[PDB]
Write an enzyme that holds these catalytic residues in place. Structure first.
Site, PDB file in Angstrom:
ATOM      1  N   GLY A  14       0.801  -1.206   0.000  1.00 33.18           N
ATOM      2  CA  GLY A  14       0.000   0.000   0.000  1.00 33.18           C
ATOM      3  C   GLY A  14       0.838   1.260   0.000  1.00 33.18           C
ATOM      4  N   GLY A  16       0.337   5.860  -0.449  1.00 33.04           N
ATOM      5  CA  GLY A  16      -0.589   6.972  -0.498  1.00 33.04           C
ATOM      6  C   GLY A  16      -0.053   8.146   0.294  1.00 33.04           C
ATOM      7  N   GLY A  19       1.606   7.477   3.578  1.00 35.89           N
ATOM      8  CA  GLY A  19       2.911   6.853   3.538  1.00 35.89           C
ATOM      9  C   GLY A  19       2.861   5.533   2.798  1.00 35.89           C
ATOM     10  CB  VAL A  21       1.109  -0.654   4.459  1.00 39.30           C
ATOM     11  CG1 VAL A  21       1.078  -1.936   5.283  1.00 39.30           C
ATOM     12  CG2 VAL A  21       0.372   0.461   5.179  1.00 39.30           C
ATOM     13  CE  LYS A  34      -0.021   4.582   8.069  1.00 40.04           C
ATOM     14  NZ  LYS A  34      -1.203   5.131   8.783  1.00 40.04           N
ATOM     15  CG  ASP A 135      -9.813   8.066   8.252  1.00 38.56           C
ATOM     16  OD1 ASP A 135     -10.734   8.484   7.519  1.00 38.56           O
ATOM     17  OD2 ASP A 135      -8.683   7.768   7.814  1.00 38.56           O
TER      18      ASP A 135
HETATM   19  C1  U0C Z   1      -4.972   0.244   6.690  1.00 36.64           C
HETATM   20  O1  U0C Z   1      -4.103   0.317   7.827  1.00 36.64           O
HETATM   21  C2  U0C Z   1      -3.052  -0.580   8.010  1.00 36.64           C
HETATM   22  C3  U0C Z   1      -3.053  -1.839   7.369  1.00 36.64           C
HETATM   23  C4  U0C Z   1      -2.034  -2.827   7.481  1.00 36.64           C
HETATM   24  C5  U0C Z   1      -2.192  -4.153   6.688  1.00 36.64           C
HETATM   25  C6  U0C Z   1      -2.255  -5.419   7.352  1.00 36.64           C
HETATM   26  N1  U0C Z   1      -2.409  -6.635   6.756  1.00 36.64           N
HETATM   27  C7  U0C Z   1      -2.517  -6.694   5.419  1.00 36.64           C
HETATM   28  C8  U0C Z   1      -2.461  -5.517   4.617  1.00 36.64           C
HETATM   29  C9  U0C Z   1      -2.342  -4.287   5.271  1.00 36.64           C
HETATM   30  C10 U0C Z   1      -2.267  -3.041   4.378  1.00 36.64           C
HETATM   31  N2  U0C Z   1      -3.524  -2.646   3.635  1.00 36.64           N
HETATM   32  C11 U0C Z   1      -2.991  -1.839   2.477  1.00 36.64           C
HETATM   33  C12 U0C Z   1      -4.325  -3.761   3.054  1.00 36.64           C
HETATM   34  C13 U0C Z   1      -3.473  -4.813   2.373  1.00 36.64           C
HETATM   35  C14 U0C Z   1      -3.520  -5.014   0.985  1.00 36.64           C
HETATM   36  C15 U0C Z   1      -2.762  -5.981   0.263  1.00 36.64           C
HETATM   37  N3  U0C Z   1      -2.862  -6.125  -1.185  1.00 36.64           N
HETATM   38  C16 U0C Z   1      -2.474  -7.308  -2.008  1.00 36.64           C
HETATM   39  C17 U0C Z   1      -1.901  -6.930  -3.410  1.00 36.64           C
HETATM   40  N4  U0C Z   1      -2.808  -6.068  -4.205  1.00 36.64           N
HETATM   41  C18 U0C Z   1      -3.255  -4.909  -3.406  1.00 36.64           C
HETATM   42  C19 U0C Z   1      -3.829  -5.318  -2.024  1.00 36.64           C
HETATM   43  C20 U0C Z   1      -1.920  -6.745   1.133  1.00 36.64           C
HETATM   44  C21 U0C Z   1      -1.862  -6.561   2.474  1.00 36.64           C
HETATM   45  C22 U0C Z   1      -2.625  -5.594   3.177  1.00 36.64           C
HETATM   46  C23 U0C Z   1      -0.978  -2.445   8.335  1.00 36.64           C
HETATM   47  C24 U0C Z   1      -0.913  -1.195   9.027  1.00 36.64           C
HETATM   48  O2  U0C Z   1       0.180  -0.926   9.845  1.00 36.64           O
HETATM   49  C25 U0C Z   1       1.332  -1.758   9.704  1.00 36.64           C
HETATM   50  C26 U0C Z   1      -1.966  -0.228   8.871  1.00 36.64           C
HETATM   51  O3  U0C Z   1      -1.884   0.978   9.541  1.00 36.64           O
HETATM   52  C27 U0C Z   1      -2.514   1.133  10.798  1.00 36.64           C
END
Ligand code: U0C
Length: 298
Positions: A14, A16, A19, A21, A34, A135
């Protein structure tokens, strides 16, 4: 135990304005890292306070592992390390699959249980305070392997304790996501000096997430495509005034598909969201009532 220098950043899941992830490897196991953007430093501070000082821990809240600062590329990066949920966000999950009745209710009840944990203060010695998220969206909700969800991103949270009757809003330049903004926020009538106002903003955003999920539950061989809230009226990255025209001026709410009225679960869910969407904030249900009602719905 877990320190930034011992984590291997494998791939970026992720990016944006907040920042980035990353999916990271620490001692073989997967972890989520993150790396806060410079503009979002205040969110890292508030989140670090909640996970470390308040020691927020609940099975429907993103599992915190460690906070850290790392000096890389002649700059100090602010890190948050949590558990890694390979299914991604509910926003990603909804687009990849549809839901049966049990999977849909499991999702929304787990979110309600997480929100009720935040809103409800545990009293007494070292008791956790009442917390509003501010949020809530589907991108800030992660899907675990057992079909339950957990709430993520505490960078905007506000805190309140009944005994002392102190409200802690911090000073974060961050604004909530405009697409999920409650009407009292869009027209600036929200009482910022009253904690209940912030809980009711969560309830509004919750109702929007409930709409996103229920659209994906199939009844009688019919299901809606995944769509974000107000997908039909606001553009991508909607403006503050775009949302004001939709939510405040025209008093619009996400449409209930007619096929929902021939399914008892979706019909009860449809009543539930509309009770989260009152223009009058004090009329919306509490997180606990939502959790109780979702517990009883079949
Ligand atoms: C949205 O807040 C957070 C979240 C995560 C997090 C946790 N576990 C899985 C994922 C995420 C990040 N979010 C972007 C969803 C995500 C998406 C994908 N992808 C696969 C490939 N194609 C695009 C989607 C993979 C893993 C995660 C971690 C954080 O702190 C370390 C966050 O901050 C508080």
């Amino acid at each position: 135990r877990t320190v930034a220098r011992d984590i291997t950043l494998l791939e970026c899941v992720g990016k944006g304005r907040y920042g980035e992830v990353w999916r990271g490897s620490w001692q073989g196991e997967n972890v989520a890292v993150k790396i806060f953007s410079s503009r979002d430093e205040k969110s890292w501070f508030r989140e670090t306070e909640l996970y470390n000082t308040v020691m927020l821990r609940h099975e429907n809240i993103l599992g915190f592992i460690a906070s850290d600062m790392t000096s890389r590329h002649s700059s100090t990066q602010l890190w948050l390390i949590t558990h890694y949920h390979e299914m991604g966000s509910l926003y990603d999950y909804l687009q990849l699959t549809t839901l049966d009745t049990v999977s849909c209710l499991r999702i929304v009840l787990s979110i309600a249980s997480g929100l009720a944990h935040l809103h409800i203060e545990i009293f007494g010695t070292q008791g956790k305070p009442a917390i509003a998220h501010r949020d809530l969206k589907s991108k800030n909700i992660l899907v675990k392997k057992n079909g339950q969800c957990c709430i993520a991103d505490l960078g905007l949270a506000v805190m309140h304790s009944q005994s002392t009757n102190q409200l802690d809003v911090g000073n974060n330049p961050r604004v909530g996501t405009k697409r999920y903004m409650a009407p009292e926020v869009l027209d600036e009538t929200i009482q910022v000096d009253c904690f209940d106002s912030y809980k009711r903003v969560d309830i509004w955003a919750f109702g929007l997430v409930l709409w996103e999920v229920a659209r994906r539950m199939v009844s009688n061989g019919i299901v809606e495509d995944y769509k974000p809230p107000f997908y039909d009226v606001v553009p991508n990255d909607p403006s503050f005034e775009d949302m004001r025209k939709v939510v405040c001026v025209d008093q619009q709410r996400p449409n209930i598909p007619n096929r929902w009225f021939s399914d008892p679960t979706l019909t009860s869910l449809a009543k539930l969201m509309k009770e989260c969407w009152y223009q009058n904030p004090s009329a919306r249900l509490t997180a606990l009532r939502i959790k109780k009602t979702l517990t009883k719905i079949d």
